[PDB]
Structures are given as C-alpha cells and as structure tokens.
Amino acid sequence: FRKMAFPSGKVEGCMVQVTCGTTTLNGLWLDDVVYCPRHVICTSEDMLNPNYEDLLIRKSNHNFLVQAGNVQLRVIGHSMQNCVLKLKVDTANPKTPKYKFVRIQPGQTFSVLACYNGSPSGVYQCAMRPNFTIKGSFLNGSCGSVGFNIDYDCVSFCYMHHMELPTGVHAGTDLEGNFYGPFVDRQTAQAAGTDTTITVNVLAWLYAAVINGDRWFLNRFTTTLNDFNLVAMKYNYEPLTQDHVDILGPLSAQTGIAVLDMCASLKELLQNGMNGRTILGSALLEDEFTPFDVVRQ
Amino acid sequence: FRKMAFPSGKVEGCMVQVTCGTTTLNGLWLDDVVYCPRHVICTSEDMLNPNYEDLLIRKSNHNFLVQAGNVQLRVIGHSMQNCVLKLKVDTANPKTPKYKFVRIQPGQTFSVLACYNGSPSGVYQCAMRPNFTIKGSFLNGSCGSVGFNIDYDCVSFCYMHHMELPTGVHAGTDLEGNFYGPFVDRQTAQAAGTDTTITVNVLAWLYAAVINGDRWFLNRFTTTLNDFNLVAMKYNYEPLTQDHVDILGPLSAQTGIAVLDMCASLKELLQNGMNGRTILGSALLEDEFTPFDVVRQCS
Numbered sequence: 001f002r003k004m005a006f007p008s009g010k011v012e013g014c015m016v017q018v019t020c021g022t023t024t025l026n027g028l029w030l031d032d033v034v035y036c037p038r039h040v041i042c043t044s045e046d047m048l049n050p051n052y053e054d055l056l057i058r059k060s061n062h063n064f065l066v067q068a069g070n071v072q073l074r075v076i077g078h079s080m081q082n083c084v085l086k087l088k089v090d091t092a093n094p095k096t097p098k099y100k101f102v103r104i105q106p107g108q109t110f111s112v113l114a115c116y117n118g119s120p121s122g123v124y125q126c127a128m129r130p131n132f133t134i135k136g137s138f139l140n141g142s143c144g145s146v147g148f149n150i151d152y153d154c155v156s157f158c159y160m161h162h163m164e165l166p167t168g169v170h171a172g173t174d175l176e177g178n179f180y181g182p183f184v185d186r187q188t189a190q191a192a193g194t195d196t197t198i199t200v201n202v203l204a205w206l207y208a209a210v211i212n213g214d215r216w217f218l219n220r221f222t223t224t225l226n227d228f229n230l231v232a233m234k235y236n237y238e239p240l241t242q243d244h245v246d247i248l249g250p251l252s253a254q255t256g257i258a259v260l261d262m263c264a265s266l267k268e269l270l271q272n273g274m275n276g277r278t279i280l281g282s283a284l285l286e287d288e289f290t291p292f293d294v295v296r297q
Numbered sequence: 298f299r300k301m302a303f304p305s306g307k308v309e310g311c312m313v314q315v316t317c318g319t320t321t322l323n324g325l326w327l328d329d330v331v332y333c334p335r336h337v338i339c340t341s342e343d344m345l346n347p348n349y350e351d352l353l354i355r356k357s358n359h360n361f362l363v364q365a366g367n368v369q370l371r372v373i374g375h376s377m378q379n380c381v382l383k384l385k386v387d388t389a390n391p392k393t394p395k396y397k398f399v400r401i402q403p404g405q406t407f408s409v410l411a412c413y414n415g416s417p418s419g420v421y422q423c424a425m426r427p428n429f430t431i432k433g434s435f436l437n438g439s440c441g442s443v444g445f446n447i448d449y450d451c452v453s454f455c456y457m458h459h460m461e462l463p464t465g466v467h468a469g470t471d472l473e474g475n476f477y478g479p480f481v482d483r484q485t486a487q488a489a490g491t492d493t494t495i496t497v498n499v500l501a502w503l504y505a506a507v508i509n510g511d512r513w514f515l516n517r518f519t520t521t522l523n524d525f526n527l528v529a530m531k532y533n534y535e536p537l538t539q540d541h542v543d544i545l546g547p548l549s550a551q552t553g554i555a556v557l558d559m560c561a562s563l564k565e566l567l568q569n570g571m572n573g574r575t576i577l578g579s580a581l582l583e584d585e586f587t588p589f590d591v592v593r594q595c596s
Binding site: 013 | 298302307309432580
C-alpha cells in the first residue's frame with residue numbers, strides 16, 4: 001500500500017515559465033490567463049515588507065516574460081487577487097482542460113506537479129495538514145507548482161506553492177490567492193501552529209495494514225469515543241468526530257473491525273509505541289492517506 | 298524524502314486498449330506499433346497452461362481490437378517477441394514521444410502509470426526488488442500498464458505488467474518481452490526468491506545523510522567489496538556489483554567519501570546497530586531511493 005498520484009498530463013499542458021526582473025517561477029495557463037505567485041514582483045530591496053499594490057501598479061505588461069516552451073506569450077494585462085498574480089495573455093491555452101478552483105479542507109489530499117522553470121519534474125500526493133502546512137518536496141524555483149485532484153475529466157486545482165518554513169514544511173494558497181494558514185508572502189521565517197496528526201487518516205491506514213495481512217497491533221479491548229479522544233488529544237492527535245467515524249464505515253465493514261476497536265488499537269500504539277516493529281514498512285504512524293485513498297486500492 | 302513519480306503525460310498519450318475475444322488489457326502505442334502482453338490471446342482457461350505459438354497461429358489481424366479511447370486503430374500486422382505481442386496499426390501515434398526501451402537492473406526505480414481499459418488511473422514510483430518483483434497497486438485489468446523513467450525529453454520504457462504472484466507482489470517484462478526474474482506468463486503457482494535489502498540504495502541514503510550534515514556513522518576505515526558482500530549477505534542485503542559502485546560515483550564525488558569507505562560505515566551499522574541513534578530522522582535504513590533519486594530530491 002503506497003501513495004498514488006493522479007495522472008498529471010492535463011496539468012502539464014498548463015505549465016509555463018514567468019519571469020519578472022531576476023525572479024523566475026512557474027505559472028498556470030488556463031484560457032487566456034496565467035496565474036502565479038505575486039512574489040515574482042518583489043526584490044531583495046522590499047521582500048521583508050513588500051507593498052504589492054504599489055509594486056503592481058508600477059509594472060508594465062512588458063516587464064513580465066511568459067514562456068510556454070519555445071513561444072513567448074504576449075502579456076496584455078496584469079492584476080492580482082490576494083496573493084496570486086493574474087497575467088492576461090493574447091492567446092487562450094489550447095490545452096486548457098475542464099477545470100475548477102476549490103479550497104481543500106485539512107485532512108484531505110491532492111496531487112502536486114512539482115515544476116521548475118515552467119517544466120514539470122515530479123508528481124506526488126500531499127495532505128493539507130491541520131496546521132495548514134504541507135510536507136512537500138519543493139526546492140528553489142518550485143513556486144507556482146500546483147496541487148489538484150481529478151474527478152471524471154475535470155481538474156480541481158486547490159493549491160499553488162509559495163514558500164518554505166524553517167521546519168522544512170511548505171505553505172501556499174488556493175487559486176484565489178488566499179493562503180492556507182496564517183502565513184504571509186514576505187521573506188521572513190514563519191512558524192506554523194502545532195502539527196496535529198490527522199487521526200481519521202491514521203485509522204484508515206491501520207485498516208489498510210489489516211487488509212494487507214498485518215494484524216500485530218490489534219487488540220481485543222475497546223474504548224468509548226470520548227476516552228479515545230482524550231488520549232488522542234494528549235498526543236496531539238485530532239479528536240475523532242462522528243462524521244469521521246461514519247467515513248470509516250466501509251473499511252470497518254470490509255475488515256469486520258468496528259471503528260472503536262481500531263481506536264483501541266491506536267490508543268495502545270500511542271501509549272507504548274511500536275517497540276521496534278513496523279506497520280506497512282513504517283516505524284511511524286502515517287496520516288496522509290484518507291479513507292477514500294485507501295478504499296480505492 | 299518521498300517517493301516521487303515522473304510526470305505521466307508523455308505516457309498517457311501512448312496508452313490504448315487491446316482486446317481479443319472478451320479478454321481486454323492495456324497496450325502501448327508508439328509510432329505505428331502497439332505493444333502488449335501476449336496473454337491477451339488467451340481465454341481465462343487458456344492462461345492455466347497456454348501454448349502461445351498454437352494460440353497465435355489461430356489468430357489473424359482482424360481478431361485484434363485496438364482502441365485509443367473509443368477510436369479503433371486497425372491492425373495490419375502482428376508478431377510475438379518473447380512475452381510481448383507487437384501489433385502494427387494503420388495510424389502513427391501523433392503523440393509519440395522520444396523514447397527508448399531499456400532493461401533495468403534490480404534496485405532501480407521507475408514510475409508506473411496504472412491503467413485500466415486504456416485509461417490512466419494513477420501514477421506512482423516503484424523499486425524493482427532484488428528478487429525481480431515489484432510491489433505495485435495492480436488490480437485486475439492492469440496488465441500492459443508500463444513503467445518508465447524520463448531523462449531530458451526522452452521516455453525510457455522499462456516495464457510492462459503481466460502477473461501477480463501468490464505473495465501479492467507483481468512480475469512483468471521489459472518492452473522486448475523478456476521477464477524480469479524467473480517467471481513465466483502461465484497461471485501457475487510461482488515463487489519469487491527471498492527478497493533482500495537493496496544495498497546500493499541504502500548507500501545512496503547514507504550519502505544523502507552526509508549531504509544534509511548527518512555524518513556520525515562515518516567509519517575511519519575502508520573495506521573490500523568482497524569482504525563487504527560476504528558480510529552483507531548475512532544480514533539479507535544484496536551483494537554489490539561493479540555497476541552499483543559506478544552509479545554511486547557522483548555521490549562519492551559530491552561528498553569526498555569513497556564508496557568502499559561508505560561500505561565500511563554500513564558494515565559497522567549492520568554489525569553494531571544504530572545504538573539508539575537516527576539517520577535522516579529515522580531509526581530504519583531506507584532502500585527505495587536510488588543514487589539518481591537522491592540527487593533529484595537533494596538538488
């Protein structure tokens with residue numbers, strides 16, 4: 001049982017390179033608009049407190065170089081919506097897929113197409129964490145890489161990459177330019193809130209381990225929902241809501257392990273640890289697989 | 298560090314479905330040829346004990362249905378090459394990328410585009426285990442899905458999916474139809490060899506740790522490849538080859554640490570344990586990232 005990303009071709013056809021001054025990053029070309037992080041217009045002289053509205057009005061369309069492979073796209077207008085710069089271009093992208101912009105909830109997952117200089121480099125699954133960070137693999141030049149899910153033929157874009165935090169995790173925005181979490185597009189060291197663990201996902205992953213014939217962590221004990229939640233919170237896990245208990249019904253039915261029995265097993269794991277054993281090859285409890293991600297596998 | 302696949306679009310544009318009778322699986326359409334597992338010509342009962350030469354001689358071009366989505370590609374020739382069927386079709390694929398067919402070595406990683414009915418479902422990174430199996434998410438109808446790497450703009454195709462073993466792991470061929478490992482495309486119980494840890498990839502992981510400033514485990518001393526191999530086998534680690542030493546070259550140059558010096562460091566870790574310490578934050582040594590993967594994610 002491994003993470004699986006969506007096929008990335010529909011998104012690859014939308015990636016372009018955007019340069020302003022000496023800063024190059026990636027943009028997303030949908031119809032006649034290129035979306036990218038607005039920090040492309042900041043410089044080392046103003047990055048600690050960039051007055052983006054003042055910077056933006058002082059730019060001309062010709063200050064923005066947009067390259068789609070071999071072709072330069074002509075910028076015919078520029079504006080910003082929150083932290084996303086929108087460059088209107090004179091050509092609609094002929095590879096624009098059916099798409100929507102969504103804001104994802106913490107605990108949900110998405111695929112990331114990591115890009116550098118407008119070129120797709122890698123694809124992998126990420127979770128929006130409760131503290132609104134993501135554990136990406138984003139290096140220099142990755143800004144403007146996007147996160148998405150695919151439903152039928154429709155690409156739902158939910159993330160655009162802007163920054164790294166001193167702990168090595170990442171922060172960014174939805175495609176309306178609003179950050180996930182309390183982060184700001186200035187060049188400062190920003191800490192996140194406490195990194196609470198996605199309990200319903202850990203449980204889903206324990207069900208996945210059982211489906212794959214790993215059973216060593218199960219116990220006969222049970223627990224009430226509140227007694228589980230008291231221990232979960234002691235360990236900086238999310239309390240399990242009734243909606244989340246419901247979401248786990250399929251896996252519970254499939255395995256014949258009631259949700260609260262799996263909670264009792266997780267409680268035992270939190271209090272004792274794994275005593276040098278592994279689950280699905282991991283010495284750590286994994287919380288980036290949703291119940292949905294598990295079922296479809 | 299995380300498993301990262303290559304972008305799949307160049308391969309998505311080459312996936313088709315191939316049907317014989319009611320048996321449907323995926324194929325790969327490059328120029329005017331479609332490549333797919335030869336067991337497409339089998340009924341389910343034929344798969345228990347197939348005579349492929351006899352099955353194939355009973356087939357004509359007009360018995361093969363190739364579809365790109367709902368669009369039929371007429372078959373104008375057919376041949377069998379080892380365990381792959383090659384169907385010549387009337388249309389050259391306009392989306393054919395620059396490509397090569399490569400036969401990988403165990404320990405190497407590659408991306409799989411898991412496909413059903415010629416439609417891509419998901420993409421993920423796999424390591425070929427030393428026993429020539431892969432740990433895939435392959436459900437029924439996934440045969441003919443391919444594994445690949447992308448270098449520059451060139452797609453190197455290295456794997457085509459054929460079968461599941463009793464243990465739940467998977468087996469397949471290169472794009473010339475030769476199986477990886479001692480497997481045959483017959484629905485018979487077959488066992489893989491005992492799996493072992495991919496030593497070259499553990500060494501790449503130790504080099505990655507050094508690159509990130511985590512170097513408490515470095516030995517002052519060096520060993521020979523033979524001494525290392527004889528010890529490593531006692532810990533269920535794969536013996537190193539000269540090609541493994543060679544692919545560690547860039548990481549050895551980046552760190553200034555000779556491959557055989559890192560081997561002596563790993564030997565000491567196997568013999569003495571971690572003694573409570575961690576490497577890259579982990580008490581376990583990781584074997585799923587190649588030297589190339591380490592460079593891709595550290596640089």
